[PDB]
Symmetry: C3
């Protein structure tokens, strides 16, 4: 016999209510199999992959990941795929929860302005990736065409306080990380599996700061975690806690009490978390340069009473989270726009640089620029800075070592190069520093930095 053998659809046809990340539809709360009509529309559109960095995403339902679909094992699903008239490419779908060739792909081929449909029975409970299946498949997936479908067990999942939807992806831009402007897809980086960004939910900061996920001490949180790839395998981890359980796809196996778990490319898991003490818990890909250098950082923020018997310490700060500690980095978006418009002010630069200074510079120089006498020199009221701003550009790009004197005190240490910062970033950071802490003001431009970098 086939699995999911719960008889013909009964009751009324149900129009599925889909949700945008990071939200999940309500439990189906149903004891009979139904005919479920799913309507999903492909939209190609520019969105911000990072502040001041645009990208042409290809999306299921206007978001990356695409809309979440929730059905019950044994349901008959009538799947309608529309391709918005504004699209340039044809699209289709492969849902991993489908039993049949291509997971739906041949019968869902949809040209711009058209609609397709096919029907399948959801034989297998589990959490499943869906994605586009149109040649060149890797390009479509790299552009954002993936999401999750949950096929519930007949009795439903256990009740929890919160359910969230998080999906990792690797992205391939022609430009480097945080290089501003509209960035094309880069096929060469994609084939080589060399992403410029590794993200949760389609953008840097999508789930940090004021966009964090929330829960309270004592509550349970279920996260449906996908890995759209196209190429990477996530060493998926929660900083500061453990997963009560991890279950992949529709697997019978459930792992309990683990911290780091590998999510295949194209894979998905259901994880459960119990909040014990307050603070920010960081979901990461623990291939650490992804998390800390390419954007693969999301936050679950827990509110409630401290418990000093369990953890005596403090909330996370910019030392660990860097420039994502703060609510947002909107000033960077604004400064980038002003640069494009030819209206960039000193204050635009100052506010962008303030945002970027956090972690990146403050770890050593402090958030107030005071440093630590004899160990980390001050940027506040710094004679050394004021004496030569071109030197300061070179220091950021190329580092500094050896004995120096700053504000009457000797330092003999090492500031590593920070060459991966883009010209605008260096310029804005230095303009912030120059306009703070009784420093002499003025500004550094992106062009100034470009010239120094080329020397």
């Amino acid at each position: 016999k086939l699995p999911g053998d719960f008889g013909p659809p009964r009751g009324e046809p149900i129009h599925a209510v889909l949700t945008s990340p990071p939200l999940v539809p309500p439990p189906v709360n149903r004891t009979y199999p139904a005919k479920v009509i799913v309507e999903l529309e492909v939209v190609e559109k520019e969105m911000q992959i990072s502040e001041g960095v645009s990208y042409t995403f290809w999306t299921f339902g206007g978001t990356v990941p695409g809309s979440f679909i929730r059905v019950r094992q044994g349901d008959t699903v009538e799947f309608h795929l529309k391709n918005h008239p504004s699209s340039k490419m044809p699209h289709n779908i492969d849902l991993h929860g489908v039993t049949g060739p291509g997971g739906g792909a041949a019968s869902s081929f949809t040209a711009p302005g058209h609609e397709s449909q096919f029907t399948f029975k959801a034989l297998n409970e589990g959490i499943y990736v869906y994605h586009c299946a149109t040649a060149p498949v890797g390009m479509h997936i790299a552009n954002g065409m993936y999401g999750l479908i949950l096929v519930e067990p007949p009795e439903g999942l256990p009740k929890v306080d919160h359910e969230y939807y998080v999906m990792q992806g690797d992205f391939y831009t022609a430009g480097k990380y945080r290089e501003k402007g509209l960035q094309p897809f880069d096929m060469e980086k994609a084939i080589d599996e060399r992403p410029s960004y590794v993200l949760f939910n389609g953008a840097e900061g999508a789930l940090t700061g004021d966009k964090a996920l929330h829960a309270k001490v004592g509550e349970t949180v279920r996260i449906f975690v996908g890995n759209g790839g196209p190429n990477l395998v996530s060493s998926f981890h929660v900083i500061g806690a453990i997963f009560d359980q991890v279950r992949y796809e529709g697997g019978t196996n459930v792992q309990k009490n683990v911290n780091t778990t590998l999510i295949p490319a194209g894979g998905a898991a259901v994880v459960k978390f119990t909040a014990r003490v307050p603070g920010s818990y960081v979901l990461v890909d623990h291939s650490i340069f992804r998390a800390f250098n390419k954007g693969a950082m999301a936050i679950l923020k827990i509110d409630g009473a401290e418990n000093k018997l369990v953890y005596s310490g403090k909330e996370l700060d910019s030392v660990y989270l860097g420039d994502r500690a703060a609510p947002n980095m909107s000033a960077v978006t604004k400064a980038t726009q002003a640069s494009v418009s030819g209206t960039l002010t000193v204050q635009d630069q100052v506010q962008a640089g303030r945002a970027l200074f956090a972690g990146t510079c403050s770890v050593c120089h402090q958030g107030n620029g005071a440093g630590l006498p004899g160990v980390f020199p001050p940027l506040a009221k710094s004679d050394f800075l004021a004496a030569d701003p071109k030197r300061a550009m070179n220091i950021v790009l190329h580092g500094l070592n050896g004995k120096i004197k700053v504000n009457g005190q000797e330092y003999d240490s090492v500031m590593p190069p920070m060459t991966q910062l883009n010209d605008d970033e260096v310029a804005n950071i230095l303009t912030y520093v120059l306009n703070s802490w009784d420093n002499p003001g003025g500004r550094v431009s992106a062009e100034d930095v470009k010239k120094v970098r080329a020397q």
Copy 2:
């Protein structure tokens, strides 16, 4: 006590019958431990890694992966390794099912024209990789020196309708993907873990089209799946279905009802599949650029009656499978040979281009070149094509965007660049198009494309 403690070998010595991929030897069907004599011969030889692309493989038994070995837990295995006189390198073996230093390596060192032997007891049931263990080990493995040995449990595995043998590997050629000719091994790409091909069973198309695996609706299929590496980890997946179970090596754990499973480099699993509806099921590495851009695609084709209650849709086609939808791409091999011989005809090019057009171009332009009026312009009887074939070369290499007029209708869309196509491929595709659909004929040469690419 040691595992596999079933007493001394009894009965008669057994000469193992080894099989070539994708076939498996019969179940041992035996209730006593035996002395099993295994004879395996290393052969170095050129084979086609892709159409018109030769590679010097180093093989156990003339194939990649090497011959399949099947024994019973508790057997005494007398292992004979021969190195064919034509070999240039020495070789040896490490079988993961051996208990002892090197898995056999020191006692199996075999110079060209020599033979070695050693004896081991198969203490541990499971599916195991074997591979060469000769410095430089990575080179030997990269050249194809890996296979599987099954050590059955004493009672045998459960009966199934079909057993097949599939093994992934990563390959490192000096030339790029689909660049024709005899391709040397590339040590630099290998050290960097940057393969040019990622394959099942040693070649593009080894298990697609007319070389697909087969079964019928209702049947069970067991696949012994290896990952020879040397370097990659497979996000192993079956498009359009689920694995009933997955068991790694000799592990006690068995996962049931999963879709995507990570196979370590050097690892192996036994997977089981039950055929429910007809069509082509695609085994892939779901690190998707491997599957769709480097060759990591194999097919299990299921014949039988459709079941519209389970899946209403169609068989896979070139939109998803690309140029591997068709039975084979023999015309590409023939055209490449003709180029070498200096006898390349227009028709040779046309037939090669026909094969390559599928998916690559047809996804948008259609298999009949009609496109979709106002959305995808026609290649059939195309005034725009005819007006300027050099422009058409540039369009394939570099893409096209902006408003154009084709056959009296305006288009305002984007054709992405296709720069990864090789000169011969562009030339053959365009020659096919020019000689189809009332287009003006003539031909485009590889040299013509080379010149355009260099501009």
Copy 3:
């Protein structure tokens, strides 16, 4: 209720005794929860990452991996982090066994010459990675800032004969593998996940030869295996045996009888091994170029009686282990130092070349240089070598093929290029060969090879 609910700390405060790799502290052997005081000091210092290759490591307790910490589930841990005054960077810690934001990171921020402390309850049994959490986090981890903490179950782990501590990491030097000198950290390679070295316990050869782990036939060995990353996932494997069991972190799941297991970046496992026959067992990352080309090789050497019924063969040798078969390669360190000092003698070169010849050249030419008549030409008393030492430099760098005559016999084979050998390595190998086996003596310098390579 919280896990680890064993009541308030009792008895006396315990000062934890930490161990350096590859050793482990004794079992806690305690039936009550305690207050455990842990004191760990960060030290930045140069050490040898390979012979003659220095690197500035950042360490917890002076070693890579850092000191091992062993506590009991339910303990209250008062964690003190000191940063040695000689440090240039600030540091902190994230222990995966902590419940709380950052795993301790915000409350452990410690400038050079300072100390910090925080308290946590160890709620969860398991083996856990700890690492630095200071921006830029990837740099700190890449420089060696990781280790393991074991949180025992209340009843303790089962008794074994030996417990060892092994931790993989990926490292990023500006220079290539085995290029001599003090090598800076390379941020570009790190972001691209392109390590120059992949190591166990912080150095090539850290656990090979005279630094191998030991046990006897019949004994059980537990290894606490970490993967500090920062970036790689280990296809962790024991050559020549099986793991009796593998348990990740504090997971409920235990896998039994497996050979190859994936350890996530930031992950950790407890593996168990039962020694059955004598010899050297190789722990590797089975992404094979890491193991055999980047240093990811460690040894568990088992002493005791052979059992020919289980394995008839020989101990490992340089064919498989290469230049790590021997007790050590101290001669390479000495020759490199002599080069720096301007005192390099012929004999210094000869002894370094002797060490490097093993495997690298001996696999084909034999340890005595005799080759195999008509198959592999001799280096012993070689007329061809003597006739043209510049040609011999080119042969090592660029390979050799075609018909040649050596000592009166024709060869018609292929010696692959060995271009990844550094100039000093080629020079020392050839000087060894020239000064052995009745060859004419003299020497080849690194500068000689540099010139040939540049041709």
